[PDB]
């Protein structure tokens, strides 16, 4: 599934890590809640917590993030907002 | 009409959210601008930093401070507040 990015505020390696983490989450789970959970858990494996992930098709958000930890992208027809 | 699915605080902030949500329903047509107003109203009254997610179809894992978490439905629109 194609990974287009709407807003990226980090490095290229971190962007690709988020892309593969969303891909494995959508392949492992079919419920949006479990997909966002799996993104945050494979981020909770190799990254310190207070990260946050949202997975869905019809959702807006208003958040304030710390520096260099904000991405919002699409993988297929599902929007993923991953901020910290 | 407010449909509380999970409310981790005391009912005063929930009542304030219901009141300003009704005011935003009268003021604005779109739940997008209502979603903007929900965060912009409660960020300054209860200090930084609040976070709000509003939509009709979304899954999310949340990290919040205690007594500062709510998830509810205004009609068919789901609204989530946390830290």
């Amino acid at each position: 599934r194609k990974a287009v990015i709407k807003n990226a505020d980090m490095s290229e390696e971190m962007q690709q890590d988020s892309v593969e983490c969303a891909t494995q989450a959508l392949e492992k789970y079919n419920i949006e809640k479990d997909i966002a959970a799996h993104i945050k858990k494979e981020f909770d494996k190799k990254y310190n917590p207070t990260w946050h992930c949202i997975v869905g098709r019809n959702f807006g958000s208003y958040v304030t993030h710390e520096t260099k930890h904000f991405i919002y992208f699409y993988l297929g027809q599902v929007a993923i907002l991953l901020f910290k | 009409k407010a449909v509380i699915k999970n409310a981790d605080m005391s009912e005063e902030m929930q009542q304030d959210s219901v009141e300003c949500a009704t005011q935003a329903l009268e003021k604005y047509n779109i739940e997008k601008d209502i979603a903007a107003h929900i965060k912009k109203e409660f960020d300054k009254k209860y200090n930084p930093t609040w976070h709000c997610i509003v939509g009709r179809n979304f899954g999310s894992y949340v990290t919040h401070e205690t007594k500062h978490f709510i998830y509810f439905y205004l009609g068919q629109v789901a609204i989530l507040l946390f830290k």
Partner: peptide, 9 residues
């Protein structure tokens, strides 16, 4: 951040 979804995207 101002992120929102239009009707029928």
């Amino acid at each position: 951040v101002a992120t929102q979804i239009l009707e029928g995207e």
